[PDB]
Amino acid sequence: LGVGGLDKEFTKIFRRAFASRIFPPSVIEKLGISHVKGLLLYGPPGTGKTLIARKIGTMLNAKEPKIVNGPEILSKYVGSSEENIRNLFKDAEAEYRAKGEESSLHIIIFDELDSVFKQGDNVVNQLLAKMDGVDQLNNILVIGMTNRKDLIDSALLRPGRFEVQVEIHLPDEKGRLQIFDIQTKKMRENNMMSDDVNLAELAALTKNFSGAEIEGLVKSASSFAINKTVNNTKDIAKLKVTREDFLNALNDVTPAFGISEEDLKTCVEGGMMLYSERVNSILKNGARYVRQVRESDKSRLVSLLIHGPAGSGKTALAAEIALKSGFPFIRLISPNELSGMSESAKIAYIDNTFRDAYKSPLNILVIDSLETLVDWVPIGPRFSNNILQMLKVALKRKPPQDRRLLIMTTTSAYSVLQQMDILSCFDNEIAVPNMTNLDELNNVMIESNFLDDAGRVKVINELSRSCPNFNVGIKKTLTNIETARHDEDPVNELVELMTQSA
Amino acid sequence: LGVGGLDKEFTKIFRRAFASRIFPPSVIEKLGISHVKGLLLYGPPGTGKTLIARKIGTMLNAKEPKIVNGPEILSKYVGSSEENIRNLFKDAEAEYRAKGEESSLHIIIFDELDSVFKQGDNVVNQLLAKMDGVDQLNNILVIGMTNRKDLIDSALLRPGRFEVQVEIHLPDEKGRLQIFDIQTKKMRENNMMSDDVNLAELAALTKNFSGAEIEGLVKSASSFAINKTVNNTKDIAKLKVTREDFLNALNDVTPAFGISEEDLKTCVEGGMMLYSERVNSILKNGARYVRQVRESDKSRLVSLLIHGPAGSGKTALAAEIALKSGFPFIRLISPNELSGMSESAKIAYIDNTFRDAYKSPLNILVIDSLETLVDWVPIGPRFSNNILQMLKVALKRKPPQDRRLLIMTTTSAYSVLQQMDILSCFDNEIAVPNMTNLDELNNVMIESNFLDDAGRVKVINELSRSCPNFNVGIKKTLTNIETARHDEDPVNELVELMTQSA
Ligand SMILES: Nc1ncnc2c1ncn2[C@@H]1O[C@H](COP(=O)(O)OP(=O)(O)OP(=O)(O)O)[C@@H](O)[C@H]1O
Ligand SMILES: Nc1ncnc2c1ncn2[C@@H]1O[C@H](COP(=O)(O)OP(=O)(O)OP(=O)(O)O)[C@@H](O)[C@H]1O
Ligand SMILES: Nc1ncnc2c1ncn2[C@@H]1O[C@H](COP(=O)(O)OP(=O)(O)O)[C@@H](O)[C@H]1O
Ligand SMILES: Nc1ncnc2c1ncn2[C@@H]1O[C@H](COP(=O)(O)OP(=O)(O)O)[C@@H](O)[C@H]1O
Ligand SMILES: [Mg+2]
Numbered sequence A, B: 001l002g003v004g005g006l007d008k009e010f011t012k013i014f015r016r017a018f019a020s021r022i023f024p025p026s027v028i029e030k031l032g033i034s035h036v037k038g039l040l041l042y043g044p045p046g047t048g049k050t051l052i053a054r055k056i057g058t059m060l061n062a063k064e065p066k067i068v069n070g071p072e073i074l075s076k077y078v079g080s081s082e083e084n085i086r087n088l089f090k091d092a093e094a095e096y097r098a099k100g101e102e103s104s105l106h107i108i109i110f111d112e113l114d115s116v117f118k119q120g121d122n123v124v125n126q127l128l129a130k131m132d133g134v135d136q137l138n139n140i141l142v143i144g145m146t147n148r149k150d151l152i153d154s155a156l157l158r159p160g161r162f163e164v165q166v167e168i169h170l171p172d173e174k175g176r177l178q179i180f181d182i183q184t185k186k187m188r189e190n191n192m193m194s195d196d197v198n199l200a201e202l203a204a205l206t207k208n209f210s211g212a213e214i215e216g217l218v219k220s221a222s223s224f225a226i227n228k229t230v231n232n233t234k235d236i237a238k239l240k241v242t243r244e245d246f247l248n249a250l251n252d253v254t255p256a257f258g259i260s261e262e263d264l265k266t267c268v269e270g271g272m273m274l275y276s277e278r279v280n281s282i283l284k285n286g287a288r289y290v291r292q293v294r295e296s297d298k299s300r301l302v303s304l305l306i307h308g309p310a311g312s313g314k315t316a317l318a319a320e321i322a323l324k325s326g327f328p329f330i331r332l333i334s335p336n337e338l339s340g341m342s343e344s345a346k347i348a349y350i351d352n353t354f355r356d357a358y359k360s361p362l363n364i365l366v367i368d369s370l371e372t373l374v375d376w377v378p379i380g381p382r383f384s385n386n387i388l389q390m391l392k393v394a395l396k397r398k399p400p401q402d403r404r405l406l407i408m409t410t411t412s413a414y415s416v417l418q419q420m421d422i423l424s425c426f427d428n429e430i431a432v433p434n435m436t437n438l439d440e441l442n443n444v445m446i447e448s449n450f451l452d453d454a455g456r457v458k459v460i461n462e463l464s465r466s467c468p469n470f471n472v473g474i475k476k477t478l479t480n481i482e483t484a485r486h487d488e489d490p491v492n493e494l495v496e497l498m499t500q501s502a
């Protein structure tokens, strides 16, 4: 017909909400039952709910369904809003007096239902009157659509009202293959599509898209081929789309439920060099855990705690372990995002991020500098307890319906966490130490191209008896080489800086 | 007549509210008494109150009852609501002036009465005027309905107003047997029901349903048999519902006052293995307490405390004991449900859960992580006292009218509870210890299919002289084997991890 990827949900809606309307009234009256009058559809935006609604009605040959938007009714003036509802059902009322039980079916779609409860009452009560009360109207069927089931009051779900509930999901590979078929049919049937375009490849590149995003991608590719000829010209009849156009268009549409590439890549990495054996061990353990949470069904929530002193490398490690994983979904919470908001806004932001992470097969989250998110200052001490409780609950909840995620977190204030007794949330702890021998300094000098061997040797020979057992980090070590490089006397300057830091 | 299960109740209502209306006016005048003008019915929703109201009306062949809804009147504009109440009684006023004492009876129904008091006064005063004051009308009888008696002000219950009060209950096995007949009459009497459907079985499976759920169950079963023909065809005349349809329909309707199966089963239990004698003792004691509660009338409340270190197994034991009991009603209160709410909302939620527990023959409740529900942080220390007092009162109250329930609660901060002085609530305490011997580790490895015994011997030998006094929980032990399994060198990795944890 038109819909794609939905094959166990088009059977289950049709079995219950619609099957009885086909038969003549005699047999339905014969058994002694009643038609259902409410159906609820829930799932993330852009996934095809309104489509199913409109498309089913063409089989029954009902009237074109009316549509009403929640916030519209809520933003109208009080009296106008009150009168509006009684306007909506007028045609349905008339036809019943006209033809009794043999009237046709009428469909009403109610969108963004949750908005009414998010605080209103008059709309809800008037609406329930028309399908539950003594003024019962036996022609109508009302469809509701929401992204959040938990905000609707339980009173509405009980038998007689919104009796059947269905859930829509993001598509998998076979779904996307069918959606591509549906969207490119009309191009294919008119010899306006090249022969190198292979749809099974695109089905695998577009990893976590919804249907709407696929519409947008096709439109973009068409755009390229149009622009290639304008400046409106002869020989339009030879127009065609090509594989290169799809590959170019893939760089202009970025999906929600994707990878926050720029923040991870640029902000958190400006080098990476293996200067010791501990580093290598840390990156191997990271790979082990990524593999564990992709090939086992008895581990759907792992949490880790990379601790260490300041200037030690922590965050750059977390990022490095994530970018090599290849998961579809990756995000991070850091102080840069929460700047300038009130406390309540912060709670809302964290909660929404976690809810968005429970809608893909695989997920990674990074939490950076746990103590700064809580506003810790030791003169008081002062901190925010509400945020702490939100985080403490979140780090132990398990995603529903055989999904899975991995979490990584970074801190420099281990003792404070020990004091706040939230140290049982973590499954394992990794330690990151500083540099403490001159061999590491030699390695770091070599891989940054500091200067020729003749000078390098002299730096080590002078520090050998200037300061034998220094204790410095990596972040500071790379800001001293960089500044010393620009001096007029590089060896002496570097020696002085190193001695001061140690 | 048309209703079943509610017999006794009837006998009474008819004895008091209506018996006087049958007799001729002369004898009633002759005794020197006056009719009753108010009747209150209360009980859980969907249990059959409005049905009784209508069906009694048909025996006395009075007019069709009028109906009004509380929220409807309360939400309307102030002036319209004030003018509205006077419209409702107009017809009754007219017939009185027409025909005096010999007028027929008028019956008015008022729904969701408590909504008026839950905060209003104008409707209450105007209503009492017509049935108590000087302007009394002697034709009317008013029926009220509420789910909550305790909220109604006492001024209404005194003689002359709402003089008779009655309660409706959820049916027992015999009642459900009757309700199935009343609902399936029209199918049975027209040869559209198979010869294998046995109603005594269905009455026994549907353990805690109300009437509305039974209507829904029949409707769903009809839907199965109907859909099996379409795609609208010939031989509609051979339609028949069958036993398999009922058994499959049983999985689509879930009742309130049922079992929260998914939450108990998936989240809280992902393995169970009897690695020591203490575990067997714990489970045996749980079974003891269960069948105690089922076979005694001198123990209608029992409360338990399970305590021990973090990671020891607690919550899984609790859920494991719940699943094998076989009770109809099971729920749990845990931090996940209360996340994101304000304080007042949390209190309301807890209180409603306890109220819903007091309406079934048998009940179990599970309360998880008592110290996290109160928001304890030891720096202050800071915590919420209101929630603590609510929980402290609730754990001692006994349910009414020969019902019984069992409570289990789990915690990791035994010293804190001792400081807060709420140990007096619990009847007995159970201790869950950690692992402390190598034999237990051997059993766990055998049970989890780690690797062939040849390698298994080596782990125990190496730990026998590396660290013989280790002290770790079961959760950590089951998350270290899992990660070691995926390594390239599984023995050394597991040995190192165990040494670190101890
Ligand atoms: N082997 C390495 N491991 C980690 N970081 C490295 C390595 N080699 C170079 N670097 C660079 O060193 C810097 C380390 O700074 P980074 O922000 O990761 O430290 P940090 O301890 O998280 O800092 P802070 O806690 O003060 O915010 C980064 O620019 C990183 O790219
Ligand atoms: N004999 C057993 N006893 C307890 N848990 C077991 C047993 N065998 C396997 N398990 C598994 O071990 C895990 C125990 O974790 P659980 O959440 O019950 O611990 P907990 O004491 O509640 O932890 P926490 O204090 O961190 O909340 C569960 O996944 C459970 O299925
Ligand atoms: N599963 C799907 N199969 C085919 N087309 C789809 C699908 N999902 C989305 N589309 C396309 O995207 C458009 C927008 O989807 P829409 O029905 O508005 O979803 P929502 O109800 O979430 O807004 C549809 O009109 C259709 O062209
Ligand atoms: N004891 C019963 N026997 C038969 N049918 C019942 C019974 N109780 C409830 N029902 C069915 O449930 C339907 C809904 O009940 P309703 O009249 O709304 O009662 P209430 O709303 O007061 O719970 C009724 O129309 C009736 O068909
Ligand atoms: Mg950092």
Ligand SMILES: [Mg+2]
Residues within 6 Å of the ligand: B314, B315, B369, B410
């Ligand atoms: Mg627990």
